[PDB]
Amino acid sequence: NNYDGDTVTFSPTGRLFQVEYALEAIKQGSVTVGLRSNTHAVLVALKRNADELSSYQKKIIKCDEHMGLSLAGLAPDARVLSNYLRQQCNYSSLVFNRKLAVERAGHLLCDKAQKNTQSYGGRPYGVGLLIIGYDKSGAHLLEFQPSGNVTELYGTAIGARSQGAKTYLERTLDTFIKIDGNPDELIKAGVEAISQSLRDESLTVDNLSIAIVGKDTPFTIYDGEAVAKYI
Amino acid sequence: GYDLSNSVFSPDGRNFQVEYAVKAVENGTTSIGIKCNDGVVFAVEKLITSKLLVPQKNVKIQVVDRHIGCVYSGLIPDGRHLVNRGREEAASFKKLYKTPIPIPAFADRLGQYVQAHTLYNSVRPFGVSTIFGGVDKNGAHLYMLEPSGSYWGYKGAATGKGRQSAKAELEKLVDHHPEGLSAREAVKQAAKIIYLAHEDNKEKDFELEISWCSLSETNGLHKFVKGDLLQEAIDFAQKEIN
Amino acid sequence: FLTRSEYDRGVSTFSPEGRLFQVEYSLEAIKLGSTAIGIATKEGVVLGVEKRATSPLLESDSIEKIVEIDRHIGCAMSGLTADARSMIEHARTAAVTHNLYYDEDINVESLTQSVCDLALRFGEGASGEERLMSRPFGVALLIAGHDADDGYQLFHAEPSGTFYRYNAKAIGSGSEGAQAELLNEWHSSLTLKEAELLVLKILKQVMEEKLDENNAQLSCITKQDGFKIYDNEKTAELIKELKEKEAAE
Amino acid sequence: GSRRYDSRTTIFSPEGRLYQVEYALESISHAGTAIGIMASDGIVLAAERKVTSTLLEQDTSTEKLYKLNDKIAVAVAGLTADAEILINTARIHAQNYLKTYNEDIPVEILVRRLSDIKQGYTQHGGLRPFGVSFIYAGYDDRYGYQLYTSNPSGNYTGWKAISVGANTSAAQTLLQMDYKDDMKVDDAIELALKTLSKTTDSSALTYDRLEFATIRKGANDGEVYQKIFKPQEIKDILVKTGIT
Amino acid sequence: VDVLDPALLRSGRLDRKIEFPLPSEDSRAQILQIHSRKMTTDDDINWQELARS
Amino acid sequence: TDRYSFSLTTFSPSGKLGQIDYALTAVKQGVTSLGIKATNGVVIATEKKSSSPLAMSETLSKVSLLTPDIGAVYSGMGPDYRVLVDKSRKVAHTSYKRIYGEYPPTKLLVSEVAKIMQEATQSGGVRPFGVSLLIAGHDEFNGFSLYQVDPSGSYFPWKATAIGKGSVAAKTFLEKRWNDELELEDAIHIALLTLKESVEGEFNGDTIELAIIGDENPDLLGYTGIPTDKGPRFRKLTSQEINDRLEAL
Amino acid sequence: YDRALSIFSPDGHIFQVEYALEAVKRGTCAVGVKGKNCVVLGCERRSTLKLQDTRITPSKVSKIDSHVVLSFSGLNADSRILIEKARVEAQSHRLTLEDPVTVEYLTRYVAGVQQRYTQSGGVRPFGVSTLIAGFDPRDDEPKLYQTEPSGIYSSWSAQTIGRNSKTVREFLEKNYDRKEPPATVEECVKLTVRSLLEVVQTGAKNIEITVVKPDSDIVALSSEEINQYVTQIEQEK
Amino acid sequence: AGYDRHITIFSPEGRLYQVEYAFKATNQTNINSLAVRGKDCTVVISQKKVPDKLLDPTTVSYIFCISRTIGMVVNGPIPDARNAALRAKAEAAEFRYKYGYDMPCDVLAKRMANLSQIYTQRAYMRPLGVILTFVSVDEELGPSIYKTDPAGYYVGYKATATGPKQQEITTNLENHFKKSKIDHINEESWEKVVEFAITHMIDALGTEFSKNDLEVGVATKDKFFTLSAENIEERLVAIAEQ
């Protein structure tokens, strides 16, 4: 502790270490991969059980019938952010009679982290979210960091061993963009994408969690004996 | 201890916190503001981190009102709060006085907000430098706002990593044209010194975004330079540095 | 005491761990918890708790860690039980709220999720909810229940704000010894009196007295009879018929 | 920021004990002595001033002695600023009781109310205590003459003879040997004077350094005359007892 | 290099200031082959596979 | 946010309150002022000081008016005096010229201002004002009165006192110089003579500020034709009147 | 102020609850023993100090309703805030639900009161432990409860809290029987006096005894009475 | 405690070191001013320095118009200058509204003064590190200069200077009014007071000035104006032809 244990301070370097600390939430996080093409988005999250008598705790939350977010990091933080996204999503449906703009909602999120990083006794959130959806401008993948950086990407990951996924996506980048109208392939590309990011943790028919959104297919989360078709 | 916060004082006239905020802005990317005869022309160097990105789909120049361009460097999330605040303050003034806000008025407001964040224990002074301007009916103006809440008029301002390359070249441009230059002619100038400001930043690759607010091109609105006009600027600069 | 803790000056402050320290400490107060065992089957859920005798002058048949939320959901508290005095009221309120608004028996998972949303509300003022706590709760629950939509379910609710659905879980001090045995002896082909007798098997190992109905209590949640607290006369019979079959060895 | 520099002075010690309360008790033996001695016919309150200078005006001063109401007066020993506040809180409470029941307050009730006020400041809010000790002389019909001390923690006990302030241990020993259950007021006045002559923190003990006041049943028709004496009536009764 | 004296920031002392970076994709693959030259391997090795992983 | 509501004045381990011990030292690092109480009047006299000699001194006041019968004079801090004079007046109007429709007696005014100091001793976000005030005034029923309010919040009446840095020496001088009847004419010569032993500075009416709560002046009444009220009993002495008395010492 | 006076400890506690228990240890000793048809709370009073008015000063047994007594050990000053809450709840029960309180409901309330000052910010726990005893109305079962500053409540057959409680607790294992209380009121009083004479000692004037019988009869036995009861025990021993 | 000057708490010496630290931070712009009372005017002259060719010279300013009668000249950092400019404006609207005449300078000295005390009495507010010189021409008190400082102390002046080299100026002003033997120059027109002021400043600071390195503000009767560089240029030639 010199400048390390306080979110209001600075820092001779000009960082602060409290943000870097929150970025370890990503690091201890479980791998999840999102990739989109141009007609369909897919989030592939690797669920994690505590033990054998136990079930797995879902890692994808239906935010809307065209939007979903998946956590990586702390489970209490994620539950705060998911409620908020939903409130602002229903606000737009009510007030402007309108599906929520994906690009805009990323800035609403940003400012909520920012105000707990301005005032003392606040915290930086320890969850980074991948938020996919399909609106009037097509498929989208937003990447949320603890810092509050919002970026739109063709395909990304966060989690433990995120590097190994990201080198996979650099190969298969030009493949997935060009498959369109066949949601099936993009899912297969996502099963393989997270296989690379395993520590021999395997993929079972209740560990792998697929969720998709289309031109014509609402937000849906597959698990059960649905997933086994892709496994 | 007396070197840790903002409400502290130390007998050297230093208030170490605030000076540390400049060090944040010093990690940013180059941003320039070219003050021309007809308006203002901003450009920002936008780092392309990975080939996984979806290109030209992140704007680091955000509009406030319909006539005041705003582009900032330092902490990207932190800056987004400062712009939201100046969009509230613009909207309050637009209602109460039924005109689009003057730029010396927009200056007062923002100026006050960051100054505020050095007088309480429970807040941190924001570490961003803004560059904002446009056309109002008293003419075009440009302001650069330090994280310390310091600002001045400017015929050219910059901030960022490559504020070293950029500044020397802005001297060159007021000695090229000491009677000023056109806002059209200045699109090609913003391309040229953003490209030179990536020789302090050549570990990556980047995308150039250019926007303008000039009276004589855009009817005094804050618009983006886009399509074929934007690629003429890219080519111009690209051939000089080769 | 006085074990290195670099940071812990804020009640939410980081930490090169990547997670808060205060939440971690909250889970280290459940290893001082009086042992609560729970075996969930597809025919019913048994909540057993050691009442815990402290003295011979303490009346240990008057004190119990079986707490009713409603007729279709039961709950068991282990840890710092003063913290559970506040939450268990809240949970009972919650259920009732659902019966007012929707006239329906509340999901076990939903109910579990509600005291978790409560569990996370430590702080000096931040987020959507106004903080009214300042130190995290140091108590874990085993919400059992029965709904007619997803069957028998049993949840382990954390002071963290996390819920993991278990098929059987013991918590408390003798948690480590319990979960070795659950792993081998549990299965999904159990019947109600073979589970019941399993609760008393594992209770026998984490017992710090000896097993008798003057320091141990059983309780069930059954679909057609609801949540029922087993009285001591009934409890006695089963403990003796364990002792008959363990003497057939 | 603020939480960093927070004193936290309202937490328990390892002993279960409240450092600032003790620190308050430590500092009142740096203020002058105030004594109460309960006679059967009245109550003598005898205070020794913690200041004196020949350039002092100590003649309009009632700087230890206060009337809370015409039947219950106090002797104050400690930090005078904190004390002044409670004194007008008490007046406000007396008059409230009087508004609502149209009957004067018993001594039992007003001593419990001041004490609860103190209790709040040591209990929470991160404040420091109000470091004051009051000797309440009062008359009520329900339990008669009643004598009381309260301390900065906010706890009270009744006494037949008490001493507060400077040399508490000392004054207590003396009081126990020269007390008798039933006295006249004069004998009490004498005793009040005598204890302060052996405990005085300067060798000399004088009228201008005594504030001295009684409550006497020398009012006919079963009433009580609160008398705060003039320092020239103190001078005569001090020559009477032969001190000076 | 954060522990050096301000009289070693200066040129005249050590003028040229070289940083050794954490390895790169190409660099890792090379490193592995230089140790493994010393011992005997089988002929079904792929140095890129190990270096991705 | 803010969370400064915790006391910043606390008891010290050795007893006594550190912050008020610090404030009193500060009063003896200031200017020097004294007051003598006469039979038929009261005088206060103090030194006027400024950074540079090219600064004015008529635009500065260290004898200030609370009521037309009551002036105050300080020793301690200039900034801290200025605010409390205003608050002294504000509370004198709101709690006594609205509820009794007249000015308060000197004892009653003293006590009000002693509460304001008191909440600067209690609670967070305050540290004591570092002044000592004299409040000399006249009311009809107790006649002439002289007080001293200190950093701590107690008050004391005195018969003659001084405050400031030259204080210990000044009260010794005034001990032999006090008399049982002193006239106001005589007192004026006394205060000047004492503050001449205490001030090196060029001794004119323009550097020594003199104010008397002597006797009533029907010419400072501001109206005529009312014989019922009488004028200010306070009267600030400007440079010319002091110059005659300079020569008569 | 909204800053914590309760800082979580890595030990699995809160420091201030451990500090609050010591504070209770240093407090005067209370015994509770319930008969078949009585309750008996004996408490030590330090009357060792002389020229103490004892008439006007409240006993360390406070009636909170017409059939529920509360005795206490730990911080005497602090206790009075609990006694003022509890008297207030007792009326509220009659107002809104009708009938007098039950000993259990009141004990639970006290439990939630002391609990609150742990979990809230801006406040430190109370280091005060109560013995709550009494009757339920329409009933004649003595019910004897103990609440402790952890905000944990307990029923007890007999209990003791305060200073050197352990010495009395070992005696109570051995001279009171779980199965059989002493059946006369008088013998129950003498069993508790006999217990008190272990730590209290120093004559019979530091002993005080409150006896409660159902149907709302709280009477406190004077010194004279005690004197006779103590002398009996003295002679027989 | 090791905390003893993080907050505005007395020292063993009975002092507010925290407040003293403000006065060591009133000299960071390193600008100097001198202000003199004529007979029927007030004149205040200050230095102007621009650090670069690339600022606009007009906007760089230290003399801030508060009322239309009260000018205000600022020594010390420009962030706290502005916060001081704003508060003052607020009180000037406020006085007219409730008392039905324009704010007197005298009254602005005490309000802004009492406000300063309130910043050194909260244990969470950091005082403004600006010495304000208030110039006015009043009809009820005549031409006056009031100097407030970060403590909240103030006094009147016959002339005054501020700035780090301000000792030098004190010599010129002391010597000058020693010879005149009166507190104000007997001169009936503002022109020749601008001429006098610049002369003592040339003597004291040891450097002659130019049009673009001056900044002049003048309070006349019933209006407050600032002179531009052109009007200042005229004044300089007429010192030479005396």
Swiss-Prot record, chain A:
**Per the database entry, which stretches of residues form a coiled coil?**
none
Please indicate if the UniProt record lists Acetylation as a keyword: no
Q: Which domain of life is it from?
A: Eukaryota
Fetch the Gene3D superfamilies from UniProt. Glutamine Phosphoribosylpyrophosphate, subunit 1, domain 1 (3.60.20.10)
The subunit field of the Swiss-Prot or TrEMBL record says: The 26S proteasome consists of a 20S proteasome core and two 19S regulatory subunits. The 20S proteasome core is composed of 28 subunits that are arranged in four stacked rings, resulting in a barrel-shaped structure. The two end rings are each formed by seven alpha subunits, and the two central rings are each formed by seven beta subunits. The catalytic chamber with the active sites is on the inside of the barrel.
Add the further remark from the entry: Present with 7210 molecules/cell in log phase SD medium.
Q: What is this protein called?
A: Proteasome subunit alpha type-6
Which organism is the protein's source?
Saccharomyces cerevisiae (strain ATCC 204508 / S288c)
Ranked from the top, the taxonomy reads: Eukaryota, Fungi, Dikarya, Ascomycota, Saccharomycotina
UniProtKB/Swiss-Prot annotation, chain E:
Q: How is it modified after translation?
A: N-acetylated by NAT1.
Which cellular compartments is it found in? Cytoplasm; Nucleus
List the cysteine pairs that form cystine.
Answer: none
Family affiliation: Belongs to the AAA ATPase family.
Function recorded in the entry: The 26S proteasome is involved in the ATP-dependent degradation of ubiquitinated proteins. The regulatory (or ATPase) complex confers ATP dependency and substrate specificity to the 26S complex.
Q: What protein name is recorded for this chain?
A: 26S proteasome regulatory subunit 6A
Which organism was this protein described from?
A: Saccharomyces cerevisiae (strain ATCC 204508 / S288c)
Q: From which lineage does this chain's organism come?
A: Eukaryota, Fungi, Dikarya, Ascomycota, Saccharomycotina
Curated annotation (Swiss-Prot), chain F:
A Pfam family hit: Proteasome_A_N
Does the record carry Nucleus as a key word?
yes
UniProt-recorded name of the protein: Proteasome subunit alpha type-2
Q: Kindly give the SUPFAM superfamilies that the UniProt entry links to this protein.
A: N-terminal nucleophile aminohydrolases (Ntn hydrolases)
- What is the residue range of the signal peptide feature? none
The superkingdom listed in its UniProt entry is Eukaryota
The coding gene here is: PRE8
Its taxonomic path starts at: Eukaryota, Fungi, Dikarya, Ascomycota, Saccharomycotina
Specify the species: Saccharomyces cerevisiae (strain ATCC 204508 / S288c) (Baker's yeast)
A GO CC annotation recorded here is: proteasome storage granule
From Swiss-Prot, chain H:
Q: Name one GO cellular component term.
A: proteasome core complex, alpha-subunit complex
Q: Which Pfam families match?
A: Proteasome (PF00227), Proteasome_A_N (PF10584)
Chain positions of cross-link Glycyl lysine isopeptide (Lys-Gly) (interchain with G-Cter in ubiquitin): K223
Q: SUPFAM superfamilies attached here?
A: N-terminal nucleophile aminohydrolases (Ntn hydrolases)
Which GO biological-process labels does this protein carry? proteasomal ubiquitin-independent protein catabolic process; proteasome-mediated ubiquitin-dependent protein catabolic process
Source taxon at top rank: Eukaryota
Recorded hits in InterPro entries, A to Z, give:
Ntn_hydrolases_N, Proteasome_alpha, Proteasome_alpha-type, Proteasome_asu_N, Proteasome_sua/b, Proteasome_subunit_alpha6
**Chief location of this protein within or outside the cell:** cytoplasm
**Which UniProt keywords are listed?**
Acetylation, Cytoplasm, Isopeptide bond, Nucleus, Phosphoprotein, Proteasome, Ubl conjugation
Which SMART domains does the UniProt record give?
Proteasome_A_N
Residues recorded as bearing Phosphoserine in the entry: S228
**Family according to the record:** Belongs to the peptidase T1A family.
Free-text function comment from the UniProt entry: The proteasome degrades poly-ubiquitinated proteins in the cytoplasm and in the nucleus. It is essential for the regulated turnover of proteins and for the removal of misfolded proteins. The proteasome is a multicatalytic proteinase complex that is characterized by its ability to cleave peptides with Arg, Phe, Tyr, Leu, and Glu adjacent to the leaving group at neutral or slightly basic pH. It has an ATP-dependent proteolytic activity.
Q: What else is known?
A: Present with 15200 molecules/cell in log phase SD medium.
Query: Mind telling me what this protein is named?
Result: Proteasome subunit alpha type-1
Identify the coding gene: SCL1
